[PDB]
Structure formats: structure tokens, C-alpha cells
Structure 1
Amino acid sequence: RGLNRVHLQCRNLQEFLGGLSPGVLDRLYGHPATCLAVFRELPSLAKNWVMRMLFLEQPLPQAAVALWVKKEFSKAQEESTGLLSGLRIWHTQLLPGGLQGLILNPIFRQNLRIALLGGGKAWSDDTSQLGPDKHARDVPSLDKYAEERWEVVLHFMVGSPSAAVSQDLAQLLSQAGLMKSTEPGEPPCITSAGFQFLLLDTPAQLWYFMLQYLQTAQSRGMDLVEILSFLFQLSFSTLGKDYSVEGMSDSLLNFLQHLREFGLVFQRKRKSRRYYPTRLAINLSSGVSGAGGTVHQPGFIVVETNYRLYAYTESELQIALIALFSEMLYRFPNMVVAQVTRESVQQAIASGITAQQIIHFLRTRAHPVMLKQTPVLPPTITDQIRLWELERDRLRFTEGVLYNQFLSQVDFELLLAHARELGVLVFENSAKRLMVVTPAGHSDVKRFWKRQ
């Protein structure tokens, strides 16, 4: 903790896909699920530009792309162009003079056109013929199955006596940095990343599972490309119509039964030929479930100006979460009454939670009577929460290297200028020659001192 604390940063599919290898990307767009899934992530400018340039075989010059936009919006324009360029959609070509032509990656473009129009592949859908299936599953029972399995995983993180995790998933939770095993006679603890993982949205939690699951996909003979194509194949599916398995490798079978352990997919049998993509699997998307209401579950916490939480939900999980960032007084078979004490939040940040998790948690589960307010939370309470976290987080730490008490002043700004030159300047002085450089990048300037 001589570094900074573990701030749980969602990648939002840009820092994930921007930062890979372009051969991995050119294989990744080889299924239309991935092309639609990268398409909908785009900002609306880049969205409309791809849908503009889609039906086209000529590299348009740079002048037309810069000349399609009104003058006031150039600050919010270069982000869309740069995001198309870095994500290997727009590969740059040349008109035969000096006009740098721009053209969509024909793998990406061809598979988007397969996603919109007729195609040569078949989305890996198959059925030999099996009609009304032996133990066909019902849609609210798929909802129930999703709730049961993913709340079992959440109770496992919380540490209930409902610990039905089958110890590959527990090893996954230990490997992703969430449940640290210490002193190996089996206490599984919770890391502060686990507490910040709990207060997050359900699609954000599942997508963080998939990102930190594929972060260590070099382990079990897994490849990123086929797994991400299967994820984007799941989240573009329908609860009603039923699928088959024939057309999948054996490592896909191991991933799909591990995914059954996640609860995102309802099988019937392990040796079966059918899977039901669950309601958790459809809403798998890098985004935000809302600020007043969730498609998954309607909100249930009434936050009054008395710093008073009225939770209309019976669940030991969500009672434990409201125990995390508050303190609880009454429990009725319909309702829990809790009070947000200063000391409760200062306990919730001692274990490590930046209180944007808390405010977004309460905005996610906002009860439908708490709605029809344009500030859905009372801003006295919200600004008080932010003032409490700013009292707790008042130290900012940085490892540095000192320059003090120089013999001159020309070498002072010379060392400062060489620090600014190689981008290793941290903190400077004006009067008493007290400089802070990066300590890992200090040996460059130190060997420069042995050279002058």
C-alpha cells in the first residue's frame, strides 16, 4: 500500500480491445456477433460513420471525413476518428496523389454486412430435429435459475454456509484477485477488490468476470478469440428459442460447463446436446444498468433525508450489502430499516470502497416511489457521502526520488529540463532546490550525471 489503493476500474471494452494485437483483432471480427458487439459499443459519430461507409469500395479522402462535421464539434470529433483508427476498423489507404484514403477493415465490414444482411455462415445455430424438449425449461424459471446460481456465487464471496461453488470457480475467484486465500488451511477471505466488486451492477459484475477471466486465458488451453465470439454469441440470443451444442470443440465444452457453474447458461445434462442462454447472459454488456432503475430487478431502497434506508427486499445477500455501507436497525418480513451513519461509511471505506460505488448502488436500486424526482437521491445525503469519503481519503502517496541542496542553479534547471525531456518530472521547487523525480526513471539522469 506504498503504491495507491486498489481502485476497481471497469475497462468498458475500449481499453480491453484497444491494447491487443491486430492479428487477434482481425481474427476476432470473423464472426458477425463480434462485429455487432463492437459496433454497438462505438460512440454515435463513429456509429453513423461506419454505417455510412459500409456500402463502399473506395478509400474516401481525409478531407471528406473532416468535412462531414459542423465546426463547433471538432473537440468531440477526433475521439471517434481515433477510436475507429486504433481499433483496426479504419485502415488507412492512399488515393494516388497524396490524399490518405480511409477504408473499413474488410473482415469487419464483411461480417457487419453478414450481421445486417444474408450470410455464408450460420451463427453456429443447429438442430437435427428435437421438438418440445424433454424437461423444457420455462422463461421465469430461467430467471429463477439465474438468480439462484449467481446469488450462490455472491453468497460464496460474502461467506455464507451456502458455499456450493465447485472449487474451480473458487480458484477463479482467487486468481482474479477477489478472494485471497491466506495460510492455506482454507480461509478464503475477501480482498478490497471483492468489496468493490459486490457493490457493482450485475452486468458490470458479469463483464468484470469475463474480463478478468480472459485476462488469465493463457492457462487452460483457452484462446481469447473463440471464447469472446461465444460470449458475443450468447448475448445476442433469445430466451425462448432453444439451441444445440453440435459444432463446438471439447475445450468449448469445458468452457461451457464452467459457464454453467457461473450460472449464465442453463444446461439439462452434462452429456446433453442443448443449452438455454439465461437472462444474465443476454444483458452481458459493457455499460451501466441505469441511475434510477434496472431492467433486471426494480429498485427497492427508499433513501430519506433522515439518512434512512428502507429496503423492501428480503434477501440475505442484499441485506449483507446494506450492512456493508450502512448499519441496520429493524427487520420485518417485507422490509429492512437501516441508518447511514458516518461511522458506517467510515467502516465501509476502511475496508476500501470509493464512495461512487455507494451512490451508484443506491441509484441502481432506487425504489419506484423514490423516482419522479429529478435528483433521485436527496443531494444533502449524496454530498454528505462524498464529504465523508473525502475525509477518509485525504492522503495521496507516490514513490519518488529526491534532489536537494545543489551546488549551483544552472544545473538545477538543467536537471529539471532533462526530467521534463524524458517525462520523469513529478514535483519541482522554485526557491530551495528540492526536486522530486521518478525513482524508477532516476537511473537515466543518474548516469547522465556521470556523463554531464
Structure 2
Amino acid sequence: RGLNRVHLQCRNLQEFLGGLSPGVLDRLYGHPATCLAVFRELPSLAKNWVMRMLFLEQPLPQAAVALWVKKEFSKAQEESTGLLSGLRIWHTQLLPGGLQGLILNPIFRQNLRIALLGGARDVPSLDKYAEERWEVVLHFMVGSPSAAVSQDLAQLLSQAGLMKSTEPGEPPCITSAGFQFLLLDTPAQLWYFMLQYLQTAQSRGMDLVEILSFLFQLSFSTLGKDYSVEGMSDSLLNFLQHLREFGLVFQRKRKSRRYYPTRLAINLSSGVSGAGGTVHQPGFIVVETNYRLYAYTESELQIALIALFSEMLYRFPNMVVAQVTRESVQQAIASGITAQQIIHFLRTRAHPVMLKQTPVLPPTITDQIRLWELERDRLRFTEGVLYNQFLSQVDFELLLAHARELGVLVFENSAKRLMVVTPAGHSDVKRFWKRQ
């Protein structure tokens, strides 16, 4: 913790796909599921530009792309062009003078055109199955006596940085990344599972390309019509039964020829479930100005989450009454939660009487929360190296300038020559002192 704390950053499918190998990408667009799935992630400018340039065989010059946009929006324009360029959609060609032509990626375009052209379980019981299996995994993270995880998934939870095993006679703990994982949205939680699952996909003979094509094949499917398995490899069978352990897919038997893509699998999308209401479950927490949480839901999981960021007083068979104390939030940040998780948590589960309001979650309450926010975390620690009591002043700004040059400046002085440099990067300047 001499570095900074573990801030749970969702990649939102841009920092994931922007930062791979382009051969991996040109194989990745070889199924139309992946092309639609990367298409809908795009901003609306790049969206309309791909749908413009789709039916076209000529590399358009740069002048027309810069000349399709009104003048005021150039600051919000180059992001769409750069995002198309870095994601290997727009590969640049040349008109035979000096006009740098732009053309969509013919592997991606040809396989989308292949995707468009030539080239019993009940639905609420599927909803129930999704709720049961994924809440069993969430209870396993919480640490209930309902620990039906089959220990490959527990090894996955230990490998993704969520449930750290320590002193190996089986206490599985929770990392602070696990607490920040709990307060997150359900599509955000599942997509974080898929990102940190494929982050270590070099382990079990897995390839990123076929698995991501199967994920994007799942989330573009229908609950009603039923599927088959014939046409899948054996490592796909191992991934699909591991995915059955996740609960995203309802099988019937392990040796069967049928899978039912569950309601968790369709709403797999890199995005936000809302700020007042969720398609999954309607909101249930009434947050009054008394700092008072009224949860209309009976569930030991969500009661444990409201126990995380609050403290709870009454429990009725329909309702839980809790109070957001300063000390409750200062306990919820001692275990490590940046309180945008909390406010977005309450905005996600906003009860439909709490709606029709200007603000999903009370702004005044948030201000009060900030006031509460400032007392437990008042020390900020940094390992440093001291420069004090120099013999001159020209070497003072010379050492300061060499610190600024190699990016190892931390803290400076103006009067009494008391500088702080990075201690790991200090040996550079120290050997510079032995060279002058």
C-alpha cells in the first residue's frame, strides 16, 4: 500500500480491445456477433460513420471525413476518428496523389457481410435459475454456509484477485477488490468476470478469440428459442460447463446437446444499468433525508450489502430499516470502497416511489455524506528520499530540474532547500552526483 489503493476500474471494452494485437483483432471480427458487439460499443459519430462507409469500395480522402462535421464539434470529433483508427476498423490507404484514403477493414467487413448474407425449461424459471446460481456465487464471496461453488470457480475467484486465500488451511477471505466488486451492477459484475477471466486465458488451453465470439454469441440470443451444442470443440465444452457453473447458461445434462442462454447472458454488455432503475430488478431502497434506508427486499445477500455501507436497525418480513451513519461509511471505506460505488448502488436500486424526483439519490444527503467522509482517512503516506541543507542554490534547482527531467519529482521547497525525490528512482540522481 506504498503504491495507491486498489481502485476497481471497469475497462468498458475500449481499453480491453484497444491494447491487443491486430492479428488477434482481425481474427476476432471473423464472426458477425463480434462485429455487432464492437459496433454498438462505438460512440454515435463513429457509429453513423461506419454505417455510412459500409456500402463502399473506395478509400475516401481525409478531407471528406473532416468535412462531414459542423465547426463547433471538432473537440468531440477526433475521439471517434481516433477510436475507429486504433481499433483496426479504419485502415488508412492512399488515393494516388497525396490524399490519405480511409477504408473499413475488409476482414471485418467481409465477415459482417457473411453474418448478414450468404457465406423444456420455462422463461421465469430461467430467471429463477439465474438468480439462484449467481446469488450462490455472491453468497460464496460474502461467506455464507451456502458455498455450492465447485472449487474451480473458487480458484477463479482467487486468481482474479477477489478472494485471497491466506495460510492455506482454507480461509478464503475477501480482498478490497471483492468489496468493490459486490457493490457493482450485475452486467458490470458479469463483464468484470469475463474480463478478468480472459485476462488469465493463457492457462487452460483457452484462446481469447473463440471465447469472445461465444460470449458475443450468447448476448445476441433469445431466451425462447432453444439451441444445440453440435459444432463446438471440447475446450468449448469445458468452457461451457464452467459457464454453467457461473450460472449464465442453463444446461439440462452434462452430456446433453442443448443449452439455454439465461437472462444474465443476454444483458452481458459493457455499460451502465441505469441511475434510477434496472431492467433486471426494480429498485427497492427508499433513501430519506433522515439518512434512512428502507429496503423492500428480503434477501440475505442485499441485506449483507446494506450492512456493508450502512448499519441496520429493523427487520420485518417485507422490509429492512437501516441508517447511514458516518461511522458506517467510515467502516465501509476502511475496508476500501470509493464512495461512487455507494451512490451508484443506491441509484441503481432506487425504489419506484423514489423516482419522479429531480435527483435519483438526495444531493443534500450526498453533501452530508462528504462531511461524514472527511475524518477517518486523514493521513496520506508516501515513501520518499530527502535532500536537505545543500551547500549552494544553483545545484538546488539543478537537482530539482534533473528530478523533473526523469519524472521523479515528488515534493519541492522554495526557501530552506528541503526536497523529496522518489527513493527507488533516487540512485539515478545519486550516480549523477558522482558524475556531476
What's the TM-score bracket when you normalise by the shorter of the two chains? over 0.9
Against the structure 1 CA distance between its residues 332 and 61, is the aligned structure 2 distance closer, same or farther, given a 3 Å change threshold?
same
**Cα deviation, residue 119, structure 1:** 4.2
* CA distance, structure 2, for counterparts of residue 451 and residue 97 of structure 1: 53
Distance 1:231 1:309, change over 3 A: same
Q: CA RMSD in A?
A: 2.3
| Cα distance, 1:437–1:142 mapped onto 2, change above 3 Å | same
**Conserved 8 A contact 1:266-1:278:** yes
Q: Describe the shift of the 1:444–1:294 C-alpha distance in structure 2 as closer, same or farther (beyond 3 A).
A: same
Unaligned runs of 5+ in 1: 121-136
Asked if the contact 1:264/1:278 (under 8 Å) is kept, the reply is yes
CA distance in 1, matches of 2:386, 2:119: 63
User: How far has the Cα of 1:93 moved from its partner?
Assistant: 1.6
- Conserved? CA contact 2:59–2:93, under 8 Å: yes
For residues 140-191 of structure 1, give each alpha carbon's deviation from its aligned partner in whole angstroms, at most 9, with x where no partner exists.
Answer: 0000000000000001111111110001001111111111111111111111
Pair 1:71–1:447, CA change in 2 (3 A): farther
Flag the 1:416–1:66 CA change in 2: closer, same or farther, 3 A: farther
Q: How many residues align?
A: 436
Q: Please report how far the alpha carbon of residue 419 of structure 1 lies from its aligned counterpart in structure 2 after TM superposition.
A: 3.5
User: Matches of 2:236 and 2:247 in 1, distance apart?
Assistant: 16
TM-score, with length taken from structure 1 = 0.92
Give how far 1:115 is off: 4.1
Q: Which moved more, 1:337-346 or 1:95-104?
A: 95-104
Tell me the distance in 1 between the aligned counterparts of 2:32 and 2:302: 38
Where does the alignment leave 5 or more consecutive residues of structure 2 unmatched? none
Distance of aligned partners of 1:53 and 1:156 in 2 relative to their CA distance in 1, 3 Å threshold: same
- The residue aligned with 1:448 is 432
Distance 2:161 2:321 in 1: 33
Give the CA deviation at 1:367: 0.3
* 2-structure distance, mates of 1:237, 1:276: 10
Tell me: CA distance 1:46–1:401, structure 2 relative to 1, closer, same or farther (3 Å): farther
Separation in 2, partners of 1:420, 1:325: 41
Aligned to 1:196: 180
C-alpha deviation, 1:449, in angstroms: 3.7
2:18 and 2:311 map into 1 onto residues whose CA distance is 42
Q: 1:259-297: CA deviations, max 9, x gaps?
A: 000000000000000000000000000100000000000
Percent identity of the aligned residues? Answer: 100
Instruction: State the 1:441 CA deviation.
Output: 3.9
Instruction: Call closer, same or farther: CA 1:85–1:451 in 2, change over 3 Å.
Output: farther
User: Is this contact kept in 1: 2:26–2:107, CA < 8 A?
Assistant: yes
How far, CA to CA, are the matches of 1:403 and 1:97 in structure 2? 59
**CA distance 1:16–1:399, change in 2 (3 Å):** farther
How far apart are the structure 2 equivalents of 1:254 and 1:391? 50
Contact kept? 1:3, 1:399, Cα under 8 Å:
no
Query: Could you say if the C-alpha distance between residues 103 and 437 of structure 1 is closer, same or farther in structure 2, counting changes exceeding 3 Å?
Result: farther
Structure 2 counterpart SS, 1:276: strand
Structure 2 SS opposite 1:164: coil
Whole-Å separation in 1 of the counterparts to 2:111 and 2:413: 57
Contact kept? 2:326, 2:373, Cα under 8 Å: no
**Range with bigger deviation, 213-222 or 419-428:** 419-428
Measured in 1, the distance between the counterparts of 2:93 and 2:401 equals 39
CA separation in 2, counterparts of 1:387 and 1:111? 55
Aligned counterparts, 1:8-47, within 5 A: 8-47=8-47
CA displacement 1:50-105 (0-9 Å, x = unmatched): 11111112222222211111111111111111111111111122222222221111
**Would the aligned equivalents of 1:265 and 1:278 in 2 still touch at CA under 8 Å?**
yes
Greater shift in the superposed pair: 263-272 or 19-28? 19-28
Provide the rounded CA distance (Å) in 1 between the counterparts of 2:13 and 2:306. Answer: 29
**CA distance change for structure 1 residues 101 and 436 in 2, over 3 Å: closer, same or farther?**
farther
Q: Residue in 2 aligned with 1:139?
A: 123
> Per the alignment, in what secondary structure is the counterpart of residue 75 of structure 1?
coil
Q: Are the aligned partners of 1:3 and 1:397 in contact in 2 as well (CA < 8 Å)? A: no
Paired residue for 1:128? Answer: none
Alignment deviations for residues 234-282 of structure 1 (CA, whole Å, 9 cap, x no partner): 0010001111101111010000000000000000000000000000000
List per-residue Cα deviations over 1:206-226 (Å, max 9, x = no partner). 001011111111111111111
CA contact (8 A) 1:32 1:112 kept: yes
